[PDB]
Design a protein around this ligand. Structure first.
Ligand SMILES: NC(=O)c1ccc[n+]([C@@H]2O[C@H](COP(=O)([O-])OP(=O)(O)OC[C@H]3O[C@@H](n4cnc5c(N)ncnc54)[C@H](O)[C@@H]3O)[C@@H](O)[C@H]2O)c1
Ligand SMILES: NC(=O)c1ccc[n+]([C@@H]2O[C@H](COP(=O)([O-])OP(=O)(O)OC[C@H]3O[C@@H](n4cnc5c(N)ncnc54)[C@H](O)[C@@H]3O)[C@@H](O)[C@H]2O)c1
Ligand SMILES: NC(=O)c1ccc[n+]([C@@H]2O[C@H](COP(=O)([O-])OP(=O)(O)OC[C@H]3O[C@@H](n4cnc5c(N)ncnc54)[C@H](O)[C@@H]3O)[C@@H](O)[C@H]2O)c1
Ligand SMILES: NC(=O)c1ccc[n+]([C@@H]2O[C@H](COP(=O)([O-])OP(=O)(O)OC[C@H]3O[C@@H](n4cnc5c(N)ncnc54)[C@H](O)[C@@H]3O)[C@@H](O)[C@H]2O)c1
Lengths: 248, 240, 240, 242
């Protein structure tokens, strides 16, 4: 397929969007290596004949291990998808500094570090592509979600920085900015709200298509940006939000 | 990807438009392209599509194009608004007639054609529209006022269309190309290194590269993408 | 008087934001020349001690006449505020072409033309400033308001174009992008809570609040600000 | 003037834009408290009749102490300007993790923490305003300046987050995004002159005072319906790429 025999690294591929991305790449012929804190990642890799590495991306040593083991296992690195991320509820008034720093480490520092590590391996095969999974919440903010909004905002401009600095290595770097996608994490957030039915309706209506997106739909955008079909696209931020950011 | 689907492409005689027409035809689509330039005839023949000589500045001609194209293809599933013109000059030098002509072709025409095409798309349960804007619709350049204003208008019109056509199951997006090596560019030059260095990839883009982005946005693979503006500029807009 | 003795042109100053802008400049000692199609602009001018010109900005001849007569009355032109605008309800599917074209003429072509005309007067005094009143609806769209969305989107990029081309004449050009403001025009459309909830401040803005932003951008305090689009929306565009 | 009797906190006020900002607020009648790691900030405070606090903004304990002592000295806190910042040359390929983290701490975490601390003081006087000094490099990137581009990008969206969360406390939060400003640091780093200047439509570098004027406006009541906004003060740099 579009990625036959290509080595693809996907962070946080145990479930949700990451899992959809890992499966999409496998369906296109890629040799996939994914990591996650969740042991369920093992099953995902088994189903797609890929490799799984249980990794805590908050730790710089673990990030180094993941790229090394993935590179050795796959034999090459062509694509890196920075999908793993976390959040810490609260505005600047109540978020605790340690939790805030942890979100910045996992959501912003990790993608920066992993991109550098992956780039050095891509150099061996003449280049490659990196896709960062940001969010519409990296372009705009929401109440009580300071750490997430700050870190994703940083990820958006980091994507531009990486695009400029890695262009010489023939590595393109882009990001997708999803709107509300029906992943386990979102279904949980909705189900645990005081009025789940109402919440679901409200979230759906944030999009022009009046429905939540599907993980597979975000995966298709990532696949496109990581493919040679997007050869003149780099440093771009692509919203995959069913029209959310087109109107208030 | 588009086997048997009806696709309308404006300004398909050369450059990006021609590449777009060829790309859809390669994917099995029934393509109807229009242009003022007669060479569009050979493009249609080479890809097995239909050519219509149309002056998009004229509203009657726009109505005629969609009617004739719909009849010829049998259905309309995708519309690509690619045709455009420019009128050199700042607000201080541009003449009103030429300014209005640029707005008619670059902004009014896409609005009108989208409405006409949408009515046909309703017959097949929806579809997709892709507008070819420009980085010069998100930013400006010296002495190119009509182009900058019309393309800026096209960018927000894309958002408007996305909102109003969502109920009809029609997605609407736009691509914003940077410097692409088309006849128009390989004419304005007729500078070289300057334009190339405007991008991080340090080279001009190829028409085919913009076409691939257009095909993606027009495809079901972009099912949750609407109202979006995608730069295809080799990293130009990522830095100054 | 931050603008004491300076000549200021304000379009659409009979009511709403335009009226507030005219009053603000007058309060600061400026010689204000405001135009509008509505007759009540006369009373506004009388109350602030300025000059009123009943003009139909859709007419290019009247636009030329306005700047010429206003310049003569004031003795000099230092600032131009393009505030006049109209809308045509409807999506691309229902808007009439003639109405769409008229919205483009008044909302986009008129500001382009007036800026050029005013710039020639500002040259006499070594430069000046132009402030275009765009809208959040020039950066984003809403349902059934295609003409307004497209024209305001064009006005946003035209502001960038003008800033680039007029810098040589030492004329800064910026735009304000107001969110929901409590003007009679808005009060009519409404005839509430939802519109207020669109802003983080949870209230509609006052015309006077938009005027203050306009005066800032038109002042020397904003000497290194040009080609900028400043939202005056109570936080609306900061979140969904 | 616009800030007569108002308590204003300015970070990194020893030199450059921060110094221009402190001087501007004092010029408008404000009671200014500025901090900086550089001891010469004392001179700025003395010149404008304000208060100086030597502070290492990378340290959370010193940040808490700064707001506490500044609030005590001024008697009230109405405005906070997050101006202090640092950079760490290098792309993601060459930057050292520790320096990258330090840049995030000073450029992004510090403004977040300080905004929270200052907001609690503003609540005592019915609200206030916060202005973050971002950069055009928070909206776009440049070569080999990853830490700065990432932190400023985060600061831009943090500005939106703060605006949404502090609105109820009647606190507006906005940011300015300066282009090339002729600070002593920039004047020393400098064909090179012409190139940097030609990045702006005005074809010249901006003055620190010009950025200060925008900050004053956004922090004033004249900007009462402006919050969560990012205002470029770049002489037209971001209006064009050619
Ligand atoms: N679902 C949405 O609506 C939505 C919208 C916008 C952006 N996104 C982004 O999409 C991505 C995935 O979202 P999701 O909904 O699938 O969420 P998710 O909770 O499933 O998170 C992604 C994966 O990251 C893993 N992970 C988190 N911290 C880790 C760490 N320190 N080490 C290793 N693995 C770690 C998690 O275990 C999880 O499997 C994220 O970057 C998220 O910010 C999602
Ligand atoms: N080439 C670039 O670098 C570049 C950059 C940004 C945006 N774009 C956009 O891409 C599109 C195509 O660009 P291009 O470089 O191929 O230019 P082009 O000169 O080849 O123009 C496209 C086609 O439009 C046709 N056309 C123009 N006015 C027409 C009318 N009234 N009726 C019918 N046909 C008409 C022309 O004959 C031409 O074949 C345009 O919308 C342009 O604005 C191009
Ligand atoms: N009110 C809001 O919420 C809001 C929000 C965003 C942007 N805006 C913008 O602010 C500006 C003023 O808005 P407003 O609410 O006061 O509206 P308004 O209805 O009062 O319109 C402004 C003035 O323009 C005049 N005008 C219109 N067409 C004219 C023509 N051809 N010749 C001469 N005068 C003409 C009108 O008579 C009116 O007095 C407009 O540019 C509008 O798009 C307003
Ligand atoms: N100079 C420019 O061209 C330019 C352009 C865009 C944005 N900016 C922004 O404007 C602001 C000021 O820039 P500047 O040019 O005056 O730079 P600067 O080097 O003078 O730095 C500002 C001040 O911050 C202080 N500072 C740095 N780290 C500190 C710490 N840990 N604790 C306490 N004080 C600390 C420095 O001592 C200095 O006095 C910054 O936020 C910068 O990113 C500057």
């Amino acid at each position: 397929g579009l990625f036959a025999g290509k080595g693809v690294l996907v962070t946080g591929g145990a479930r949700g969007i990451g899992r959809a991305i890992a499966q999409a790449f496998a369906r296109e012929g890629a040799l996939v290596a994914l990591c996650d804190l969740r042991p369920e990642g093992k099953e995902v890799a088994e189903a797609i004949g890929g490799a799984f590495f249980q990794v805590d991306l908050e730790d710089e040593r673990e990030r180094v291990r993941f790229v090394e083991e993935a590179a050795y296992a796959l034999g090459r690195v062509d694509v890196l998808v920075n999908n793993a991320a976390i959040a810490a509820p609260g505005s600047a008034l109540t978020v605790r500094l340690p939790e805030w720093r942890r979100v910045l480490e996992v959501n912003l520092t990790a993608p920066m570090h992993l991109s550098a590590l992956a780039a050095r391996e891509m150099r061996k095969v003449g280049g490659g592509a990196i896709v960062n999974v940001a969010s519409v919440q990296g372009l705009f903010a929401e109440q009580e979600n300071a750490a997430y909004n700050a870190s994703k905002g940083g990820l958006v401009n980091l994507t531009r920085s990486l695009a400029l600095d890695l262009a010489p290595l023939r590595i393109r770097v882009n990001a997708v900015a999803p709107g509300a996608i029906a992943t386990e994490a979102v279904l949980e957030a909705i189900a645990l709200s005081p009025d789940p039915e109402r919440t679901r309706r409200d979230w759906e209506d944030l999009h022009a298509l009046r429905r939540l997106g599907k993980p597979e739909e975000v995966a298709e955008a990532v696949l496109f940006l990581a493919s040679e079909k997007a050869s003149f696209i780099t440093g771009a931020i692509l919203p995959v939000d069913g029209g959310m950011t087109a109107s208030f």
